[PDB]
């Protein structure tokens, strides 16, 4: 009771307690993150050509300066333990983080926000620092696919002509980009090629029906 | 003991149980007048509204009779988890009458309103109404379609601002990844069909 | 804009918000009830007929308190909606606590705690009252089974003699009781049935062996 | 750019790939000598202690050597996911060290006493060191019963009260539904065996 | 005693498992006939459509002797307990008869015409039987097949099919409707001919905007 | 229309299956509730401890075994001859228990394995040449396997009850069971997925009956 | 000791034959990525917009497959016959994923489907007759309808950068494929699996040209 | 130009499709005959154990005729494209031999001497091969077989088995340790050496204390 064996399985139980405690928290915190980012997506869904793109996109910067300050907790919450045995906790809060942190980038720049500019926002200063992992980028990205085609089909359905191009061509790129890693990457992420591919063939065939709608000369009114 | 408490538990169990075959006599008949009802508003796709609304809405006289003697045949003290196919009615009920409202008004039935028909106070959950809503969107696109078949080029462009409007206020929702989520992935699909015909009119001298 | 669709969604957006809201609430809420329920039976899987028995019993029942609390907590956010909606959000911290709260009282009275009796305890004043579901309570006594079985094999591998029988007859009861219910019971409960049997075998082979080994009369010495 | 981005993905994966490559051939180095040694140890199972412990300690310095030309040909900057082939190997290395220090000793060895015999300071995951520990205890039930086989019957009771304390002070943790705990659930099993061979031994006139 | 047991059970599995031999042989034949079949039609969607409609005839000439042959490979009693082994084999050829008979005169195939021309028995008695399940399967196969042959058929000028076939199509799906499906594979596939109504209904859209009457 | 009369029929015919249907529900329920009774009811010799009267437990069990009989009775009038291949898969395992229970009645009776025709006989029902219900040898097969688990664990509790006699009498008879379906190329592969299970069966009996003889109990 | 003898002699062959998975993994690293290299190059024939040198793509991706007999050709001479069946599955996707590739070129290039033997020429294969590597008929048929999943694609995106000729010569061809596909009974039950989707192939090549047809466009 | 490669194509599907029907054939005796072998010797858990190694030995006699009549059902070359039909009954012949070997001699066949008993080719020329990992899963399913026949040995009163047994699965255990296995199937199958070689060491063990040498 007094052993060295019983007081080493004190100490043992102390720092288990002590790592799952800390576990529960990244949790709830990763829950937030995610739960605030998906609003976030859901927000810039709300855009269209109308006036509103502009305080909906300033309005949505406040958002995600929200979430950045949850990554700040967490970033905190980490510093001074092996990240890659709590990281199985806040991947998925990563990984909506980086879906609306690139989508609305893509909004405003229509270009893919690099995995590096994501990780400048992440840094913090009172200093604490988060980095985003490649995988957790290449997964967020993924995801950031379908709501690319979902922002495609919206701005078909309400007479938008030019958006639905360029949505088809930047996503034509990225999935280009998953066929160049193919194999290379965790099954995690192959998981993501087939929905990728359904998306490309909704966002392409939504471009092919405009196409072949708007060259069509009507000889016969009603 | 254990014994009286498992006996105790198949008590609860097997009374359960019973709740679960008399909603499912109930459902069984609701389900039988809304396809009857389905079928006097369509219809619209073979043409005076306000009669066959006039059956349509005779016919939910039968439903208000079964949705009433059902808020007794079961405590909703609850209510219990199974009814998702007790929802299923439920969301087409509510889409049949948001689609009479429409043909007659072309508006959007409120939740007030719809509770009013079916005849409810028991609840009618905002997910269901939404759904019915969904399924309405989608009656409307094929609508639009088969009117322009018709020759009636009036009323696509009646279904289009409807639509839209739908459309506005869905993504003015947060949802989480459930039935509703999914069903409304199909607005957008809706939307762009409905979208696509009054382009149709449009550059056939129709831009009215 | 003003339109009064627009304003009905909006009224949409706020209703479910806040009861997405509060299920986040719920689940965490929930969460702590399950680990610390948890820790509970791990604190009582300490026990051996040695002198601790006592201020075991009593500290585990400080901790069951903390979780009635957090219950507690989880009534007052239920009160005043319709509980089969948030019902998923917190089934699994219930079914911990009806794993505990009967484990122990298991200890205490080696005899299975009613549905009724667990409820009594979930009534607080200051007034707001909580009811474990029958499905709530098979699924957390069906759990209950795994813990005795483990402290059946305990007992047994630190001489303890009476224990492993008892064990032995109380589940073998649990279990015609399972049966007895079959295909009435949802099939989240028949789940339960193969692990239940499992757990059945181990304790009867256990005590089997005991029966078999106790009843022999060495004539040859070492 | 998208390009740019995704040939730089491709490079971390690569590189990532290439680290997973060299950890796969220090692990099968690694498993070889872990084989190898558990030989020159049972061993016990065949008689004197001092002499096998002594190669498989002079076995323990290819490991060694093998831990260093490794904190090299990776960087301890994160550390990679996939290592649970190596968290394997690394728990069969502490399983072999408890087990030369008990032989030895008959006491349980200590972390530091561990890491200073594997050669690290990179660290020793304590759920990795429980496992080894575990692995220990059923070789030691194995053992107790092989002792009295061969005639050893005063073996079996230090073995005894050694896993006995080991027993409660596993029941001292809070365990999360991992590897873990999945393991330790095979440590009262364990205890229960050894607990029937000193009441074989007992009963039989061995009562020391 | 308890060896002869398990003696004759030995021989009643040895049995059944030469039936079910028997009954796999034959449902092979009857499925390159129906591939046969199924191509003759095929070759529609690119005109003499009479002349196939007739070749594919005297190929059901080939299926009904296959199928009587199939009668004596087990006790018609013992029915549904092979039928899974020629359930999809039975839905197609019901679903290529009906095509036939739609491509003859633009109408539905009655279940008893069906059971005629594949020469089996009548639900009245004895012998081999046509399900209500595996009928309107075959029936919803030939709605899917109809949405393609209008499109197809608009592709290659015939302007009038897509409207007979939009009739037709709406027809099976108010019949359908009054149904109660509780089989689960057929409601399955019975959400699917929603979809085929939808592509007509398009397809006829698309003629009537551009004066195609 | 004619469409919609081919329709409003195939109506008729739905309707009417789906009358069946609930009927043969309904019966198996009653089947199923009475297997759960005859169940709670011998297992009870598992208790050892005390008197356990399996001979009046098992005229208990013939009582209710006739209430199945009468139940199952009731179909046979009803639904055409083929039809019952056809909503097999609705009384699939309540039969296969109640050839499970039978055989063990049977077993704690005689010690044998009942032949299949005495197990019709017992539940009421008409042989493969009369029309009515069936015993599907599968669904026979699958009882005794069922029983075989049951065996090996009454072995067990047999010996914790301070019986020593019955484990050895289910070590031969669990061996016959082996080797008899060893005669037989396993038709099905659900009932393979049993049959796999029975060697876990026969290794745990042997290994009682090891535990004994080695502590000098014949 | 004898057994130790047979265990240490067993330890050398696994070794052995581990080699030879090792090599086989290199090698089908190799062909993996110069088979990424040669998709991401075809895949820009969907991008229609712009030059699109398909004649000078098709140059590269000859180059490309002449890289791939080369390194394909390493393996003949050092594994027995008999192992190229074994180690199969290792090298089944990169070779199914090839022959794909190929029948895209070649349809490129002439609007027609490589005979197998065109393709194992190709890629620098022994035909069924001489030891080495060989084309196995289900790994041809795959890439066959990875081939049919892409023209439908390609068919799409055709229309999209203003081709209209195209289209029509997908539909002809996919059609062609889906009738030679039926003239099989088809063994195995993955290929089975894509046949599935042959046909949505078929529906989908066939509304564009419809989509054409109906707007006047041939 | 396309039909003719899916004619030709159809051919080749044809045939293989033959050929797998021919193996499944050959294959079915080979488990009819091992099911046979595996009674015969079973029956010696209950006694003449070289009686029955003979009558099994003639049985391995039918089994090598099957074995040369099924090589000439497919290309030699082909061997491992259709492995997998045989895989089983070819680990179960191995361990039936294995089993044979022990009863009489009490050590392990060789794998050359198990090719031999089978009429099979040596690994070293052309014909039908006993892959490593096969013979190595037939003597685990001998290790199991073999801590079961101590238990049962000590049932029967025969105590000297049970010590043999153990000092033979110690050794196949230290062999085993050898290897580094890669064949998922195979490590999985070793996973369970462990249970034998601990029951067999429990036997020894009950028959020590109780003192029986
Ligand atoms: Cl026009
Ligand atoms: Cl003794
Ligand atoms: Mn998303
Ligand atoms: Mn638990
Ligand atoms: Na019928
Ligand atoms: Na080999």
């Given at each position: 009771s007094s052993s060295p064996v019983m007081l080493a399985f004190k100490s043992f139980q102390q720092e288990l307690d002590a790592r799952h405690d800390k576990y529960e928290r990244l949790v709830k915190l990763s829950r937030d993150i995610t739960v605030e980012s998906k609003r976030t997506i859901f927000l810039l869904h709300?855009?269209?050509?109308?006036?509103?793109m502009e305080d909906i996109l300033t309005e949505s910067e406040i958002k995600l300066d929200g979430v950045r300050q949850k990554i700040f907790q967490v970033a905190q919450e980490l510093?001074?333990?092996?990240?890659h045995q709590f990281h199985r906790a806040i991947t998925t809060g990563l990984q909506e983080y980086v879906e609306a942190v690139s989508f609305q980038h893509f909004i405003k720049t229509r270009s893919l926000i690099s995995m590096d500019e994501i990780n400048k926002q992440l840094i913090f200063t009172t200093t604490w620092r988060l980095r985003v992992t490649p995988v957790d980028y290449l997964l967020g990205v993924a995801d950031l696919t379908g709501e690319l085609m979902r922002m495609c089909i919206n701005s078909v359905g309400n007479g938008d002509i030019d958006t639905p191009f360029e949505v088809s061509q930047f996503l034509r790129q990225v999935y280009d980009g998953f066929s160049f890693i193919g194999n290379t990457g965790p099954y995690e992420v192959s998981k993501k090629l087939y929905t990728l591919k359904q998306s490309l063939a909704k966002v392409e065939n939504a471009c092919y029906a405009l196409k072949v709608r708007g060259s069509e000369i009507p000889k016969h009114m009603l | 003991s254990v014994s009286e408490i498992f006996v105790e538990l198949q008590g609860f169990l097997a009374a359960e149980q019973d709740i679960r075959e008399e909603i499912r006599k109930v459902v069984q008949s609701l389900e039988q007048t809304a396809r009857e009802i389905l079928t006097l508003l369509q219809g619209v796709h073979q043409q005076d509204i306000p009669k066959r609304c006039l059956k349509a809405r005779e016919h939910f006289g039968t439903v208000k009779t079964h949705l009433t003697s059902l808020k007794t045949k079961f405590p909703?003290?609850?209510?219990?988890?199974?009814?998702?196919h007790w929802r299923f009615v439920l969301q087409r009920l509510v889409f049949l009458a948001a689609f009479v409202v429409y043909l007659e008004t072309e508006t959007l039935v409120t939740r007030e309103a719809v509770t009013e028909i079916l005849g409810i106070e028991f609840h009618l959950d905002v997910e269901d109404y939404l759904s019915g809503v969904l399924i309405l969107a989608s009656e409307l696109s094929r609508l639009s379609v088969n009117s322009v078949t018709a020759?009636?080029?009036?009323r696509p462009l009646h279904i289009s601002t409807f639509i839209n409007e739908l459309d506005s206020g869905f993504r003015l929702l947060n949802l989480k990844n459930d039935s509703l989520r999914k069903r409304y992935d199909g607005l957008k699909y809706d939307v762009k069909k409905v979208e696509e015909v009054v382009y149709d009119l449009s550059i056939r001298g129709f831009n009215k």
């Amino acid at each position: 009771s007094s052993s060295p064996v019983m007081l080493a399985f004190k100490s043992f139980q102390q720092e288990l307690d002590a790592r799952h405690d800390k576990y529960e928290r990244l949790v709830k915190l990763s829950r937030d993150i995610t739960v605030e980012s998906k609003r976030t997506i859901f927000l810039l869904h709300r855009i269209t050509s109308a006036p509103d793109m502009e305080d909906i996109l300033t309005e949505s910067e406040i958002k995600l300066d929200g979430v950045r300050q949850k990554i700040f907790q967490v970033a905190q919450e980490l510093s001074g333990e092996d990240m890659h045995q709590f990281h199985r906790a806040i991947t998925t809060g990563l990984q909506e983080y980086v879906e609306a942190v690139s989508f609305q980038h893509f909004i405003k720049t229509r270009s893919l926000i690099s995995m590096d500019e994501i990780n400048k926002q992440l840094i913090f200063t009172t200093t604490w620092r988060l980095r985003v992992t490649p995988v957790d980028y290449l997964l967020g990205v993924a995801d950031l696919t379908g709501e690319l085609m979902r922002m495609c089909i919206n701005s078909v359905g309400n007479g938008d002509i030019d958006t639905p191009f360029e949505v088809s061509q930047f996503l034509r790129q990225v999935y280009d980009g998953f066929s160049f890693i193919g194999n290379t990457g965790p099954y995690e992420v192959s998981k993501k090629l087939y929905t990728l591919k359904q998306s490309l063939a909704k966002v392409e065939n939504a471009c092919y029906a405009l196409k072949v709608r708007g060259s069509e000369i009507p000889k016969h009114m009603l | 003991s254990v014994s009286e408490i498992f006996v105790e538990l198949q008590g609860f169990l097997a009374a359960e149980q019973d709740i679960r075959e008399e909603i499912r006599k109930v459902v069984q008949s609701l389900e039988q007048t809304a396809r009857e009802i389905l079928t006097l508003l369509q219809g619209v796709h073979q043409q005076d509204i306000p009669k066959r609304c006039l059956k349509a809405r005779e016919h939910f006289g039968t439903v208000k009779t079964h949705l009433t003697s059902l808020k007794t045949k079961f405590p909703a003290e609850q209510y219990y988890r199974f009814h998702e196919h007790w929802r299923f009615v439920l969301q087409r009920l509510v889409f049949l009458a948001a689609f009479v409202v429409y043909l007659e008004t072309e508006t959007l039935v409120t939740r007030e309103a719809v509770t009013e028909i079916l005849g409810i106070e028991f609840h009618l959950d905002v997910e269901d109404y939404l759904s019915g809503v969904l399924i309405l969107a989608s009656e409307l696109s094929r609508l639009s379609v088969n009117s322009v078949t018709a020759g009636d080029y009036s009323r696509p462009l009646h279904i289009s601002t409807f639509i839209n409007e739908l459309d506005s206020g869905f993504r003015l929702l947060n949802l989480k990844n459930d039935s509703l989520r999914k069903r409304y992935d199909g607005l957008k699909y809706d939307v762009k069909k409905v979208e696509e015909v009054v382009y149709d009119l449009s550059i056939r001298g129709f831009n009215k």
